[PDB]
Amino acid sequence: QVQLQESGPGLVAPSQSLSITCTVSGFSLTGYGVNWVRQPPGKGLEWLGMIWGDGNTDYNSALKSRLSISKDNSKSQVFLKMNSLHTDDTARYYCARERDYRLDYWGQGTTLTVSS
Amino acid sequence: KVFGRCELAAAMKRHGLANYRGYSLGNWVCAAKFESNFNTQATNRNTDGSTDYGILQINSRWWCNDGRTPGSRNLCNIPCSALLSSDITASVNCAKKIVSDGNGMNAWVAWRNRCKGTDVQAWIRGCRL
């Protein structure tokens, strides 16, 4: 059974950075990509970026300068790091598995709110 | 014959490989690259005694018959020599028999190890399809 689960800090100050972990099971990170997507309350979906099975990365054009994605294959973990927080970064963050050009399994998400 | 990437992609598409059993077109082009380097007459004798033939390296102990491999099953029901043409029809037909479900490309070790998990679509972007 393929599973993905997000873990975050919940509340973060604009002076600090955002760090979220995606723990997976039921498949190897070397054979599939993992995408990051967010959704502000009451709004639609926004694509953040991805890390391919081979370790290469790609990001959202407007957000690229402040995002970083990496992973640890042996520990089945994927990491998302974001700096220069704004209140506009308040949203539910999801990690999802990509299989040959479709997001087939998604995590339940983790909510994040940017303090003052 | 040695194919260029866009030329092989176009032929594979005409032969119904795009999304065959859920597999996007680039998977097939990537597999051919690592298996035969786009060479329609490639061969490789495995230590175990069998030999791999053609653009998609079809095996002589399970899929085609070369009349020289112990335990030959010949599941595609075809002579291995008939798979070395410039026309990919025969090789594509056997490949479709091998991949009976959405997980069948695992039949090619080079695809599993060197193509799965990479941007296989990169092998076909810019090809006038």
Next chain:
Amino acid sequence: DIVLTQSPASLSASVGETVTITCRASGNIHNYLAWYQQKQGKSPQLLVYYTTTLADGVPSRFSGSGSGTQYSLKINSLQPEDFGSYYCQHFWSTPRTFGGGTKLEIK
């Protein structure tokens, strides 16, 4: 980058009716388009991939079509479990983008 325009923003319909949603891209995406369904308080779920292929377990009443820059999702004789939101997403190179969403509600 390639942007997706999804319409309409909302639909009010009754069980048994047939509805259609459109997704048009600013550049050719070569059939690499997927659709997702999202119920209130849940994560998005895959419905259709590569324009026309239904995901496992998805009912035949759902059908996808399109090519080049224009695509559509049709639901024939909609049922109670179909109400919720729908989103299109493209996979032609990077970056990937989503359409703005459509809310299907009970009439």
